[PDB]
């Protein structure tokens, strides 16, 4: 249907053009036309603060007689349940309160959090769940709804509100935190931007109208800053006392009313809403320009406009701490009690240092302290939440494990370690040891053919080393989902299919500027691409995604690096053929069109046939034919072709049984050191101790 008014704004037309759903198209038009007539946004607002400007009202070894009780609001997303459990263990005290909001799209994490809320009476989860996208206006809705709920919980007499993510960690003990806040229980802790205020409004987009819908922040046009109030902002991590939270929730004065309307259509609203209300409210004289946090900002790495697909704006993110940053947690300039961000899949060592420094070492003999396990697929979420690539390869890993079981037993009689696969994988874990990726752990079901009984197993598969080499080059890798801020591939295993667009990365050490040549070679020695790159004298990482026509020929690809025709190093990566299409066994007409190389005979318009003889890469006419025969195969023939390629690039390190087994050489998973069923006390949550702590 047509809109209620003529829509001529360039930005709004662009959003209507890109919006997918009918529901979202109408909400865009309605908001635009309401703003067109000037009855959506307030233009003047009352200020209730008696101060002409701001406040900024500026030891913890004493024992308070009336210690404050804290309400921790944890807004979490992702897969890092075990790291979250570890931080929860570090901040837990029986006298505090914990209200956990789990992103609507993180169901695995929500199931793990429910097990926590059931063990402890002072831990609850929000029954409502939002899809909190970066910068989305739904984050302020999340905070404001949680404050209303918390104020109505009569049995929870809390004095402070603290918000935390799964990437935060305490840098001081709970006892010191309670002592400090008990001494300043009438103060609100908020950190401002600390730069020019006019530029702050422009960089944040406060003068722009945004609308959240279909998990996207659409930019609709311009708007005026309301007159009569002072707009401030900064970090959206704060500490607010119950008095001020009560005012924000229940006040109907001109300031709170018009700000809730203004900030319903605001990008990053939690980064300026609470600042602005407090500064212009009767509580303005309580603000401390310090949020008691250390945020690891490194804008030379974290400002890459990496959310352009979620919001109609650019943005920045803090970096993850590394072990060399431990000294920063010992400064005494200003008081600080929390820090972010931490990520166990990026660097766990610094987390261990921080935790043992606060609460002491674990006893000698404690297992798992240098290990990390992260679940990347759980059966209740369904195979349709996986892709055809990950589903194909997880099945292959499981079969690789069963083949290890059969070959591990040596006997002339019947083999009691012979299995037949059943169904789909039950779960998949990433496995790290001392900040070094070890591979995948696949839990799967199978029938033991000797006794004819079903068993559950977990298999450990690890990728074979492929990088082969006084230059500056330190490492070379091919992958997808390159993280420019943390300089790593988020597709950890390098799982690739024919329709994927690989990326070549190189890592360099200090040295003078040089230029190198990169060569991409497909499984039958066809050169796909060639280009030179200047390695700046300061460059540490380089990467590039060549434009290759799809589908990619399946098999083992090779990337080579030369310096004026002098070979330097090389790496390999696997483009795997797929056994599933839409989660169903692939049909001959589909396998044919997908596994026979790119439509155009070559990968790019430019050809490089002149380089095959120079690089000693002849093209055997027999391989090309066999590759054509492999492209039409299905079923068993295709399963044997895939498993052959996987076996050449992956190793089944071990396999264990979760319950009773008939295979006499199979370990019990709980008795191994690598299984996700083995003890991991640092992330396990037991009974509350006499001191009220879990750690």
């Amino acid at each position: 249907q047509p809109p209620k008014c003529d829509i001529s704004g360039k930005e709004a037309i662009s959003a209507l053009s890109r919006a997918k759903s009918k529901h979202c198209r109408q909400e865009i038009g309605e908001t635009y036309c309401r703003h067109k007539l000037g009855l959506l946004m307030p233009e003047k607002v009352t200020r209730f603060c008696p101060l002409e400007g701001k406040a900024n009202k500026n030891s913890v070894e004493y024992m308070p007689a009336n210690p404050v009780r804290i309400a921790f609001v944890l807004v979490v997303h992702g897969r890092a349940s075990r790291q979250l459990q570890r931080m929860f263990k570090a901040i837990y005290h029986k006298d505090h309160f914990y209200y956990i909001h789990v992103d609507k799209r993180s169901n695995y994490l929500h199931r793990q959090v429910l097990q926590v809320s059931r063990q402890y009476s002072n831990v609850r989860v929000t029954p409502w769940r939002m899809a909190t996208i970066w910068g989305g206006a739904s984050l302020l809705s999340t905070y404001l709804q949680s404050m209303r709920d918390l104020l109505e919980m009569t049995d929870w007499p809390w004095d402070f509100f603290i918000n935390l993510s799964a990437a935060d960690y305490p840098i001081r003990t709970n006892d010191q935190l309670v002592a400090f806040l008990s001494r300043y229980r009438d103060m609100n802790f908020l950190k401002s931007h600390g730069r020019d205020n006019a530029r702050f409004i422009r960089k944040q987009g406060l003068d722009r109208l945004f609308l959240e819908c279909d998990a996207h922040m659409w930019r609709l046009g311009d708007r005026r800053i309301p007159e009569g109030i002072a707009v401030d902002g900064g970090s959206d991590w704060f500490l607010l006392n119950r008095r001020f939270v009560e005012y924000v929730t229940f006040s109907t004065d001109d300031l709170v009313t018009k700000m809730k309307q203004f900030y319903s259509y605001t990008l990053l609203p939690a980064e300026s809403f609470f600042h602005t209300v407090l500064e212009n409210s009767p509580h303005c004289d309580t603000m401390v320009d310090n949020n008691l946090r250390i945020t690891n900002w490194n804008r030379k790495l974290g400002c890459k406009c990496q959310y352009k697909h979620i919001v109609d704006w650019c943005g920045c993110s803090p970096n993850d701490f590394k072990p060399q940053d431990f000294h920063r947690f010992q400064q005494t300039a200003r008081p600080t009690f929390f820090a972010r961000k931490f990520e166990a899949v990026v660097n766990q060592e610094i987390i261990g240092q921080l935790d043992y420094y606060l609460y002491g070492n674990y006893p000698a003999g404690t297992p798992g302290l240098r290990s990390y396990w992260e679940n990347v697929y759980d059966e209740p979420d369904g195979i349709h939440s996986l892709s055809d690539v990950t589903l194909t390869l997880y099945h292959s890993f499981a079969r690789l494990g069963l083949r290890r079981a059969e070959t591990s037993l040596h006997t002339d009689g019947e083999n009691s370690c012979r299995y037949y696969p059943m169904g789909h994988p039950a779960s998949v874990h990433l496995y790290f040891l001392a900040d070094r990726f070890q591979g995948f752990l696949i839990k799967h079901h199978a029938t033991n053919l000797a006794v004819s009984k079903l068993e559950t197993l977990e298999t450990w598969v690890m990728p074979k080393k492929v990088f082969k080499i006084f230059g500056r080059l330190q490492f070379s890798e091919v992958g997808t989902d390159w993280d420019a801020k943390e300089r790593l591939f988020r597709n950890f295993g390098g799982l690739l299919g024919p329709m994927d667009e690989p990326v070549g990365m190189q890592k360099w050490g200090k040295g003078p500027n040089v230029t190198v040549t990169v060569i991409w070679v497909d499984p039958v020695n066809v050169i796909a691409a060639t280009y030179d790159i200047l390695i700046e004298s300061t460059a540490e990482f380089t990467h590039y995604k060549p434009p290759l026509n799809l589908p990619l020929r399946p098999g083992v690809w090779t990337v080579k690096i030369l310096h004026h025709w002098v070979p330097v190093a090389e790496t390999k990566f696997l483009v795997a053929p797929l056994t599933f299409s839409n989660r169903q066994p692939i049909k001959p007409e589909e396998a044919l069109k997908l596994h026979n190389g790119p439509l155009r005979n070559a990968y790019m318009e430019q050809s490089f046939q002149s380089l095959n003889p120079v690089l000693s890469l002849p093209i055997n006419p027999a391989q090309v034919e066999q590759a054509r025969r492999n492209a039409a195969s299905t079923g068993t023939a295709l399963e044997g072709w895939l498993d052959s390629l996987v076996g050449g690039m992956w190793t089944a390190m071990d396999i264990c049984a979760t319950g009773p087994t008939a295979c006499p050489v199979m370990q019990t998973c709980s008795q191994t050191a690598w299984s996700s069923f083995s003890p991991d006390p640092k992330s396990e949550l037991g009974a509350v101790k006499p001191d009220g702590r879990l750690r």
């Binding site: 600390g194 704006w313 920045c316």
Partner: peptide
């Protein structure tokens, strides 16, 4: 260190 996660356009 400065605060604010927004960069223009």
């Amino acid at each position: 260190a400065a605060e604010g996660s927004g960069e223009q356009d």
